Write a protein that binds this ligand. Structure first.
Ligand SMILES: [Zn+2]
Ligand SMILES: [Zn+2]
Length: 214
């Protein structure tokens, strides 16, 4: 099932009963987690306009509130809706490093509460956050759903259609390979991988990203 907004700006696509991918327009992906305690997003959107519209679309459809968002790094595609989160009382989780970079770049601060490995539970939905090391950015994290074996790779992970690394001005191209290897070691059985941008794949996306780094 795939549901679009008023224009084609915002699309949501069901992965399973409780997990959707959100995509906004260059495209950008996140998750929507439909939990018994509320909706949880992995990642916001480009700006406050799109973030508000995403929150409203999912609140209406799932008939519950967005309670929490996990921010996967401090660039605009991820943190651009932070103002909106804070003024609506939506908790914005991040690592300390992501928060510090957010503040350095003039954005409102997320919580800085995530560690190298953090295990969260929202109602019945388990969510693990993992900092694998530097790659696309210094601060990039991935998100793992152990009940579905679904990995949210973020911009650390490139889609099949991606033919180069994209924006590397903030990247660590020597360390990015070790970081991907750390993900592959930690999560040996992956059902789906959601890249930061592009189509959902599997572990092949991590192997593709390694090849792009050669
Ligand atoms: Zn980025
Ligand atoms: Zn990105």
């Amino acid at each position: 099932t795939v549901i679009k907004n008023e224009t084609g700006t915002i699309s949501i696509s069901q992965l399973n009963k409780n997990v959707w991918v959100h995509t906004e327009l260059v495209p950008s992906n996140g998750l929507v987690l439909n939990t018994s305690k509320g909706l949880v997003l992995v990642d916001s959107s480009w700006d406050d306009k799109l973030t508000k519209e995403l929150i409203e679309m999912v609140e209406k459809k799932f008939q519950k509130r967005v309670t929490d968002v996990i921010i996967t790094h401090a660039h605009a595609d991820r943190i651009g809706g932070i103002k909106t989160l804070k003024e609506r009382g939506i908790k914005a989780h991040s690592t300390a490093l992501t928060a510090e970079l957010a503040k350095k770049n003039g954005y409102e601060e997320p919580l800085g509460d995530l560690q190298t490995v953090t295990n969260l539970k929202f109602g019945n939905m388990k969510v693990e956050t993992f900092y694998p090391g530097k790659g696309h950015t210094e601060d990039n994290i991935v998100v793992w759903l152990p009940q579905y074996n679904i990995l949210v790779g973020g911009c650390l992970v490139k889609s099949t259609s991606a033919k180069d690394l994209g924006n590397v001005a903030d990247a660590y191209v020597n360390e990015w390979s070790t970081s991907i290897e750390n993900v592959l070691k930690r999560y040996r059985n992956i059902n789906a991988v959601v890249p930061g941008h592009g189509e959902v794949g599997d572990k092949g996306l991590l192997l593709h990203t390694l090849d792009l780094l050669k």
